[PDB]
């Protein structure tokens, strides 16, 4: 009965974001929740919330996200309640991914002694797991050094194996052709 749109999207931080919920019948009320993977269900909207997110009806309800920032990334779900008491019916959610604007990208890969660290690549880039079933690579995440206002992308590759070396940890990924590999 409840339909959300799109299923998923990726935008650069700063862009505005419009998500969609569409219900079959006459609703009564309608709530939007938000949940990072691992986290719990936060009620965003029962309209406004603090002002940076807003909502509209038309039964096409839709949610507006102004100046998205990395911390907006998560799952957005639409629940409609067709009476003051009848149970919520949850849409299927929309996967939002907000991705930093890397001004001065510095594609590099380093060795960390007690691991391999892919870092400082500009957001367009994407990281693949190895077919090598005893090598461990993580998905990129963005780290926000709020202090000196700097945002960085990164991922980590590692395995207890002599062959493996930082020059070849990300061979399964397409990585900027000018990625810096230190001696």
């Amino acid at each position: 009965q409840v339909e959300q749109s799109p299923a998923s999207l990726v935008l650069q931080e700063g862009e505005n974001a419009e998500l969609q919920c569409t219900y079959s019948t006459t609703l009564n009320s309608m709530q939007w929740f938000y949940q990072r993977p691992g986290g719990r269900l936060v009620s965003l909207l029962y309209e406004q919330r603090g002002g940076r997110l807003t909502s509209s009806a038309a039964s096409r309800s839709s949610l507006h996200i102004s100046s998205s920032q990395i911390t907006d990334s998560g799952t957005y779900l639409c629940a409609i309640a067709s009476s003051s008491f009848s149970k919520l019916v949850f849409g299927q959610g929309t996967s939002l991914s907000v991705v930093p604007n890397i001004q001065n990208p510095d594609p590099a890969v380093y060795q960390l002694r007690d691991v391999c660290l892919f870092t400082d690549f500009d957001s367009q880039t994407n990281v693949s797991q190895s077919k090598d079933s005893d090598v461990y690579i993580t998905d990129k995440c963005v780290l926000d050094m709020r202090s000196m206002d700097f945002k960085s992308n990164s991922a980590v590759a590692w395995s207890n194996k002599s062959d493996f070396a930082c020059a070849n940890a990300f061979n399964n990924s397409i990585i900027p052709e000018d990625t810096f590999f230190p001696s």
Partner: protein, 238 residues
């Protein structure tokens, strides 16, 4: 700010598990849900009022109890593998806004033997990175844990920190294609070069693990893999 308890649980098939829900919104309606891929939430039981309960969409294998306006409990009497899921409870005013609880990670197992805590290691900033960028990245790997319920935090000079931190959204499987696979997880903390180069500076990686309780019996020739903290640490340099 509705609560439910325990925060996590590991159980053997056939064991009894009791999840508790408590709300002070003076709501009348309460609900018990499970959430797991690639379903969403699914209703098990709910309640309109003290001393009554309703079958939800999936009442099988679960019972519910509504002893008061404030309390709603879920009982799994003879635990099965299919009851592994994340359970949320909820309360709602009948015409207003619904609020969810913080959730319980519940893990059901054939046996508790497969249960392991994380081993935890920290990796110091590459000199190359410092030379090149004048910033420095520390890495934490938590490896070999099971089941995959951990919470990782960084403590700088004995104080928890958030600026410059990024942890993976979720743990990765050490052998992704089989059963009873164990888990790993990394996190990053980046600081200025002149901050790592301060040898007075202390960085700790903390991983909270959710495993067994004291009351589970234990036969293995090792430390009962109980809910516990495991850490690793480093000081500045050069």
């Amino acid at each position: 700010a509705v609560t439910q308890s325990p925060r996590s649980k590991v159980a053997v098939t056939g064991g009894k598990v009791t999840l508790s829900c408590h709300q002070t919104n003076n709501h009348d309606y309460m609900y018990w849900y499970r959430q797991d891929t690639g379903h969403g939430l699914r209703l098990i039981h709910y309640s309109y009022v003290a001393d009554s309960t309703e079958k939800g969409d999936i009442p099988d294998g679960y019972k519910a109890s509504r002893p008061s306006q404030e309390n709603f409990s879920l009982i799994l009497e003879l635990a099965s593998l299919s009851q592994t899921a994340v359970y949320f409870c909820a309360s709602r005013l009948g015409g207003y806004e619904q609020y969810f609880g913080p959730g319980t990670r519940l893990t059901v197992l054939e046996d508790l033997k497969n249960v392991f805590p994380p081993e935890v290691a920290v990796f110091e900033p590459s000199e190359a990175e410092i030379s090149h960028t004048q910033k420095a990245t520390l890495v934490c790997l938590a490896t070999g844990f099971y089941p995959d319920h951990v919470e990782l935090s960084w403590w700088v000079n004995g104080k928890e920190v958030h600026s410059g931190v990024c942890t993976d959204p979720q743990p990765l499987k050490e052998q992704p294609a089989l059963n009873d696979s164990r888990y790993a997880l990394s996190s990053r903390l980046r600081v200025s070069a002149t901050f790592w180069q301060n040898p007075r500076n202390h960085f700790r990686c903390q991983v909270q693990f959710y495993g067994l309780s004291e009351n589970d019996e234990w036969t293995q020739d090792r430390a009962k893999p109980v809910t516990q903290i495991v850490s690793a640490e480093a000081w500045g340099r050069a």
